Write a protein that binds this ligand. Structure first.
Ligand SMILES: CC(=O)N[C@@H]1[C@@H](O)[C@@H](O)[C@@H](CO)O[C@H]1O
Ligand SMILES: *[C@@H]1O[C@H](CO)[C@@H](O)[C@H](O)[C@H]1NC(C)=O
Ligand SMILES: *[C@@H]1O[C@H](CO)[C@@H](O)[C@H](O)[C@H]1NC(C)=O
Ligand SMILES: *[C@@H]1O[C@H](CO)[C@@H](O)[C@H](O)[C@H]1NC(C)=O
Ligand SMILES: *[C@@H]1O[C@H](CO)[C@@H](O)[C@H](O)[C@H]1NC(C)=O
Ligand SMILES: *[C@@H]1O[C@H](CO)[C@@H](O)[C@H](O)[C@H]1NC(C)=O
Ligand SMILES: *[C@@H]1O[C@H](CO)[C@H](O)[C@H](O)[C@H]1NC(C)=O
Ligand SMILES: *[C@@H]1O[C@H](CO)[C@H](O)[C@H](O)[C@H]1NC(C)=O
Ligand SMILES: *[C@@H]1O[C@H](CO)[C@H](O)[C@H](O)[C@H]1NC(C)=O
Ligand SMILES: *[C@@H]1O[C@H](CO)[C@H](O)[C@H](O)[C@H]1NC(C)=O
Ligand SMILES: *[C@@H]1O[C@H](CO)[C@H](O)[C@H](O)[C@H]1NC(C)=O
Ligand SMILES: [Ca+2]
Ligand SMILES: [Ca+2]
Ligand SMILES: [Ca+2]
Ligand SMILES: [Ca+2]
Ligand SMILES: [Ca+2]
Ligand SMILES: [Ca+2]
Ligand SMILES: [Ca+2]
Ligand SMILES: [Ca+2]
Ligand SMILES: [Ca+2]
Ligand SMILES: [Ca+2]
Ligand SMILES: [Ca+2]
Ligand SMILES: [Ca+2]
Ligand SMILES: [Ca+2]
Ligand SMILES: [Ca+2]
Ligand SMILES: [Ca+2]
Lengths: 324, 129, 130, 103
């Protein structure tokens, strides 16, 4: 393939990856991997060629780089032109000769390589103007629907003219422009703040959140009427439907509802079971355990299943159609 | 009992797939719930175009140095070719900057915001819905 | 050597890599966590052939085939040899072996032509009848 | 070259454990050359550039016993032919009868 190189030793034809001096190649010439991976202790190659007996012992963390003395240094240091490893394996002339920089990196006229994104970020990462040169940095027209500001940043268009300093340099807050008629608010779907030039969706006006950073939107809402029936009240002065009082959810926000869960006392028209469940008195003796604990039917006399029924040794009555 | 959808217990009894680590001894021999089966997965080895982290984690090569901690253990951003002083005062990051001990910075957005997909120095808003 | 010469198997307990496979024993053989090796046939048959019991961890028993007339399978999904089925020993700990269902006496053949029937559930050749 | 390693060839590094076991591991043989000479005696001789000691009779026997040749390079006397023999410029001893016989 064109991602490989072609050589013939005598008559046979061989194909080999075109990888650089900072990479290592494996058995069968199947794949090439960064040199630090060679002896890191993890079999990276498709075969055992990665860490054969030629690799010396390993003395540091996975993915790092090792030096011929017996010391390790991080891998991006390999050819930064400064000996981060005193052994001199770092900046080894053999490795830096025919140097090539990985895809996560960009290279400049200074024979230096910097992370690809660092380009045009106001810092001369190449140690010279090459990575910040306005000639190549200019004309970086970002995507449509976005806005571009003096900080050299691109931001959503909607984020313009809100007190959130999103561009960092306050460039997205042209106060004089923001207070112009074009920025004015749609009273039918939006809301405006008492001390700010900001507009928020009308539903947001009251939700328990300071949608206006001056807290001016929510100020109006206060109603929480504690209806006397079908409702329950909480220590923090909040009211919730009575059914919510004991359901395993802390609806009050202070657990005032759930902590008082004592089985409801049965009325004079009811009967009580082992789980203190309450059932109509008629259920106490009908030959069915309306309470799964058999509170009913255990005390009752051993009466018999009237006609059109079948009986079970458990003291149960079942329609004959069900019998077989 | 096919092994991926169903499970067989040491008692030569079969249990459904979800039961295998539901926390119940669905089969009385207690083979189900055994640590041998339930223990956490073996993370895949980092492939070409990726990077390795002390954390037993793999990060895409592009992410390896972008002022954001992608390895989780900061193993990605640590040790990049410094070049000029990467001081927070540059105000490169939109919302938050943290200066590293050895120089350089890592950036985070405020809650409800995540670093933008096309520019990790900028921030975009999480669609919590 | 692969044979427990110490009762605790401490001899083989520290054997080095015996084969470059990383395994301790060859094909047509079974290996145990004590680095002791046993004929595969002995797997899951009611005898801890490996002193540490690794030769019959019950999970292993499901795989071995057991033809019903020469071998027997127990409710524990473990296999036992034919003679063991009613030898009077719980060769398999579930006690399926020795069950009365299996051990009870045979069902006598029905009397065929040329034979005679007896109150005794017995058949007699017609000539012998008187 | 390497850490915890030995170097004996141009651009090559070899494990230290291999040195001093008689194995010609280094293609250039230096794995055995530097092993420290080890005391020996009782009729045996030891030679430079090797950690080997050999019977004294072998030292001057015309055989290269040590790879450096010290056993034959050291000073030892030559030999000459008997009265029953004849000598020629080849550094040879031949029977005296052969002195003049058209052969
Ligand atoms: C110079 C010398 O005699 N060195 C040693 C001697 O110390 C003794 O160890 C001997 C027997 O081992 O070998 C030789
Ligand atoms: C390697 O590290 C050790 C300490 O871990 C140090 O003594 C030695 O000098 C280092 N090697 C070099 C070449 O500086
Ligand atoms: C919106 O409401 C404000 C306050 O009542 C008012 O001053 C403004 O004229 C209104 N604008 C429109 C377009 O209705
Ligand atoms: C660069 O940063 C170092 C601290 O790491 C500081 O001492 C030095 O003064 C800085 N130099 C410049 C030019 O900012
Ligand atoms: C920066 O992050 C810290 C927490 O890491 C937070 O307390 C602070 O408010 C943030 N500041 C900005 C401007 O986002
Ligand atoms: C590896 O195992 C095989 C059986 O699968 C065995 O025959 C072989 O001898 C072992 N390796 C070698 C070549 O020693
Ligand atoms: C069975 O009980 C019913 C009432 O449920 C009647 O009393 C019926 O007469 C009883 N039958 C018998 C046989 O006692
Ligand atoms: C990852 O998986 C392999 C099998 O594919 C092994 O179980 C290995 O033990 C696992 N890795 C680690 C670090 O335990
Ligand atoms: C033991 O087994 C490991 C893993 O297979 C290696 O093969 C190692 O070389 C073996 N040890 C010896 C000394 O043979
Ligand atoms: C004889 O054998 C049959 C099956 O072939 C049944 O088991 C039957 O129960 C036996 N006869 C008697 C009398 O029990
Ligand atoms: C040489 O050695 C021989 C033995 O072969 C005789 O001793 C002879 O006398 C010697 N001759 C000389 C000249 O030394
Ligand atoms: Ca490796
Ligand atoms: Ca360096
Ligand atoms: Ca830059
Ligand atoms: Ca803004
Ligand atoms: Ca609000
Ligand atoms: Ca509740
Ligand atoms: Ca009832
Ligand atoms: Ca029924
Ligand atoms: Ca379970
Ligand atoms: Ca990163
Ligand atoms: Ca056995
Ligand atoms: Ca038995
Ligand atoms: Ca040697
Ligand atoms: Ca000699
Ligand atoms: Ca002659």
């Amino acid at each position: 393939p064109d991602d490989f190189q072609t050589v013939q030793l005598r008559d046979r034809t061989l194909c080999m990856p075109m990888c650089s001096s900072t990479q290592f190649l494996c058995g069968n010439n199947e794949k090439c991997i960064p040199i630090w991976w060679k002896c890191d202790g993890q079999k990276d190659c498709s075969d055992g060629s990665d860490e054969s007996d030629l690799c010396p012992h390993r003395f540091c963390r996975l993915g790092q780089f090792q030096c011929r003395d017996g010391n390790c240094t991080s891998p991006q240091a390999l050819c930064n032109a400064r000996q981060d490893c005193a052994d001199g394996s770092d900046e080894d002339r053999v490795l830096c000769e025919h140097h090539r920089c990985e895809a996560n990196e960009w290279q400049c006229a200074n024979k230096r390589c910097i992370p690809e994104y660092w380009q045009c970020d106001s810092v001369d990462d190449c140690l010279d103007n090459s990575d910040e040169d306005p000639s190549h940095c200019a004309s970086r027209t970002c995507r449509p629907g976005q806005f571009k500001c003096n900080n050299g940043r691109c931001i959503p268009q909607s984020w313009k003219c809100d007190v959130d300093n999103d561009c960092g340099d306050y460039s997205d807050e042209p106060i004089h422009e923001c207070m112009t008629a074009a920025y004015n608010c749609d009273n039918h779907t939006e809301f405006s703040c008492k001390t700010n030039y900001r507009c928020i969706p009308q539903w947001a006006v009251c939700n328990g959140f300071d949608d206006c950073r001056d807290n001016s939107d929510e100020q109006g809402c206060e109603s929480v009427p504690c209806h006397p029936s079908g409702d329950f009240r909480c220590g923090n002065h909040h009211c919730i439907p009575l059914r919510w009082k004991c359901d395993g959810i802390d609806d009050c926000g202070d657990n005032s509802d759930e902590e008082s869960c004592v089985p409801r006392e049965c009325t004079e028209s009811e009967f009580r079971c082992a789980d203190q469940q309450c059932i109509p008195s008629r259920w106490v003796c009908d030959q069915e355990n309306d309470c799964g604990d058999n509170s009913d039917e255990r005390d009752c006399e051993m009466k018999t299943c009237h006609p059109e029924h079948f009986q079970c040794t458990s003291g149960h009555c079942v329609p004959k159609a069900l019998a077989c | 009992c096919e092994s991926p959808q169903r499970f067989r217990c040491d008692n030569s009894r079969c249990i459904y797939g979800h039961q295998l680590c539901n926390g119940v001894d669905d089969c009385g021999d207690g083979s189900d719930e055994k640590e041998e089966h339930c223990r956490k997965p073996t993370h895949k080895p980092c492939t070409d175009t990726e990077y390795k982290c002390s954390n037993g984690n793999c990060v895409s090569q592009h992410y390896v140095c972008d002022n954001v901690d992608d390895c989780g253990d900061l193993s990605d951003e640590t040790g990049c070719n410094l070049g000029e002083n990467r001081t927070c005062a540059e105000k490169i990051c939109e919302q938050n900057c943290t200066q590293l001990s050895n120089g350089g910075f890592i950036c985070s957005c405020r809650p409800g915001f995540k670093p933008s997909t096309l520019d990790k120095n900028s921030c975009q808003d999480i669609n919590e819905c | 050597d692969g044979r427990a010469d110490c009762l605790d198997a401490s001899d083989e307990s520290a054997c080095p890599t015996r084969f470059p496979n990383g395994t301790y024993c060859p094909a047509a053989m079974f290996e145990c966590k004590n680095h002791v090796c046993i004929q595969s046939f002995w797997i899951c048959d009611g005898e801890n052939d490996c002193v540490d019991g690794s030769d019959e961890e019950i999970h292993l028993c499901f795989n071995v085939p057991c033809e019903s007339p020469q071998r027997f399978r127990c409710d524990n999904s473990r296999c036992i040899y034919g003679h063991q089925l009613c030898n009077g020993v719980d060769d398999c700990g579930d006690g399926s072996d020795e069950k009365e269902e299996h051990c009870r006496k045979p069902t006598h053949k029905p009397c065929t032509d040329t034979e005679y029937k007896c109150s005794n559930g017995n058949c007699v050749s017609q000539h012998y009848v008187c | 070259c390497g850490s915890g390693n030995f170097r004996c060839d141009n651009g090559y590094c070899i494990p230290a454990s291999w040195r001093c076991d008689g194995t010609r591991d280094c293609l250039d043989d230096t794995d055995e050359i530097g092993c420290p000479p080890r005391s020996c005696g009782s009729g045996f001789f030891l030679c430079p550039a090797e950690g080997t000691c050999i019977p004294s009779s072998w030292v001057c026997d015309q055989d290269k016993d040590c790879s450096d040749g010290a056993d034959e390079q050291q000073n030892c006397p030559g030999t000459t032919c008997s009265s029953q023999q004849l000598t020629c410029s080849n550094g040879q001893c031949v029977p005296i009868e052969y002195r003049c016989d058209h052969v």
